[PDB]
Design a binder for this molecule. Sequence first.
Ligand SMILES: *[C@H]1[C@H](O)[C@@H](O)[C@H](O)[C@@H](CO)[C@@H]1OS(=O)(=O)O
Ligand SMILES: O=C([O-])C(=O)[O-]
Length: 780
Amino acid sequence: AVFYKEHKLRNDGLVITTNQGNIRLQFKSEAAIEVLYRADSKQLPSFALAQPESAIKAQLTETENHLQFSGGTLTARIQKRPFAISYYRDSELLLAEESGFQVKINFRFYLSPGEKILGGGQRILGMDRRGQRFPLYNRAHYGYSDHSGQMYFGLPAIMSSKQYILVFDNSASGAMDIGKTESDILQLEAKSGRSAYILVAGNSYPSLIENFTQVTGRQPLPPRWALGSFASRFGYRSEAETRATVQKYKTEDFPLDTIVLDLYWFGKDIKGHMGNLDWDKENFPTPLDMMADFKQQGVKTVLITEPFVLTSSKRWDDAVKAKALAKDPQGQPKAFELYFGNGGIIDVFSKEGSRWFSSIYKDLSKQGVAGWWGDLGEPEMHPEDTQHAIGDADTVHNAYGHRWAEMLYQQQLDQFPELRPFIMMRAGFVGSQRYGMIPWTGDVSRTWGGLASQVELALQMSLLGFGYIHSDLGGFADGETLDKEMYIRWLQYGVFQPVYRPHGQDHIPSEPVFQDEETKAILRPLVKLRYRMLPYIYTAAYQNTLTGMPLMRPLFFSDEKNPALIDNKTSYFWGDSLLVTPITQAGVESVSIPAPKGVWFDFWKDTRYQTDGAPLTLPTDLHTIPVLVKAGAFMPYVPAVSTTEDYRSDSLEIHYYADASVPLAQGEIFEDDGKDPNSIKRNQFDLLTLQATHTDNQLHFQLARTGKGYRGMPERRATTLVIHNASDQYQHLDINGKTIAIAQADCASTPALACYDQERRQLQLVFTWGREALNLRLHK
Ligand SMILES: *[C@H]1[C@H](O)[C@@H](O)[C@H](O)[C@@H](CO)[C@@H]1OS(=O)(=O)O
Ligand SMILES: O=C([O-])C(=O)[O-]
């Protein structure tokens, strides 16, 4: 039994007092509200919020039975007796408290009938998680396949078909019950920690995500090289083996940006060395030379680190001496029995642990390390009586990796202010994207089921802030012999997901360069294609930095008024223009693609398909996976390079997919130096835009560039524009008023400026795209 007693305004925040205590309401933006219960008391601070202290000016009005606290779009409606807060966008009800806050920590809300609920981060349960209950405790799920209620990276958040996001801003061991125990109740629970939630609203899913990342944090543009080809396994045993692998990429003609070094870099066994955090010199005798030799070939080195320091490690005594480790309640270093041996955990929440760990990263980064892999940050083992500077293990658990990322991010920005940090980690929290976290989906089994789950996992993480979620390509765990077909399918899909990082236990090769001739003949052109497509991918990355928009988008974005599409986890958008349907079983001979209505082209074959709703059946082959291009797409390409260190857009090739059904279309290509963390803030970029206007007798392109450019930007780019499904009735072309005849023969065999290929229905234009505006007009 809870009821309103009184309220005060204090610094734009509403402080309500009930019989049970104080409640602080602060708008963190016009569409986002933080609700803090037990506001009177000492609590852990917010982890989810980018600006925890902020509170924007809202309006307050009072009635007999209710209070109303409003920003721009979002309104909190506070019923006085019994006490219950509900949330409105306009006057549409988003979410209503049931009993609300109780005692343990517990929050209870009503779910509306038919409401679909995404969220929880990494689970394999179906896209709509309504009807499920699961814990909020980051934890390993080694060898998972087609099911999981609990994995490496849970998020205490949900997204609803009402277009709100709800965050439980609490770091502790907890649980979420999404209308499972009681049909119409969403319940959030924790053992301890902060008693706060955050509601974010939007008018569309893109706007919701923009609003969410506004208040939780925007991912800073990663270095372009993170969009490249990684060489990885668990693990290279020696400097000789790592060098032989870089070489294998060069001798096999596969692109390679980065090689990743797993735990053998600091010791010859899996057990007993963790915490050494220094080179095993018997096996890596000349590591500075190794890294410099790789950097000459345009190849970066990334090293694994973990939170644990073993008692058998060279750094135990020093970490104890420095007070860097978490303690027991008695005050001494907490040691416990990991797989690797008896050891402690670095306390990234303390000043002393942060300084000791940071100094180690600094030293290795000085030696030549370009990037960092933080594994086991769940933490993988985290006994409940472990004490951190700000709380016990069970209170801080789900924020350990998040703070570990923050610590490493700040450290890398301090050491290399002119570089973009690369931080790859397994476990975080809501907002960890603001520290550049690039998550992967853990120790997936080498099964079709493991592959068939990756889209669900990726979309779930993308929707709640994590654009660079990806999988270990080809699979990680167990197996005795390569499953060739599954491997190929997984590396094909790889091209159309955020990070191209095949990785697996080393009794079976993860790297495509160690595969048989047929496998390499299939994958080599695809890995190159990933490089040729860098302007498409880097431009989606740019939009993710700008607005939260994930790189992988779900089918349901295509029609916001058809909630049944939410269930789809087999087809997704890669950027604006490509609808990808990975093949996730052996021997599949054809697929049915639930393409949204409109006109679509086969990416590989150029076939045009029109549909008014019905799915398209495409045949499959072993050399590709089904990809459709949306009519009105501009697909930009550059020539393939071996490494992004050689990236140039001096030569562009742009493919436009024309159809009269699309009378206006736009595209954009974002170019900058690929490395400057301040490029966007300072406008040190070249932003190419393209607009097509398609009427009955004309097809008009307007091309332009904005931004202040950057050092080494080409002034003039040689541009080949290829118009697919181009009319055969275009007689002339004007480029900026200068008329050019369209050749109708020998397009492939003359240096033609404009040429129509009648057999392929393609019209090719070749021109110079300089700093001034350009108009290309085709007319019948
Ligand atoms: C952590 C990662 O999930 C996996 O990709 C690594 O290859 C391995 C080895 O460092 C880690 O798992 S574990 O074996 O240490 O548990
Ligand atoms: O649609 C057109 O413009 C045509 O195909 O002739």
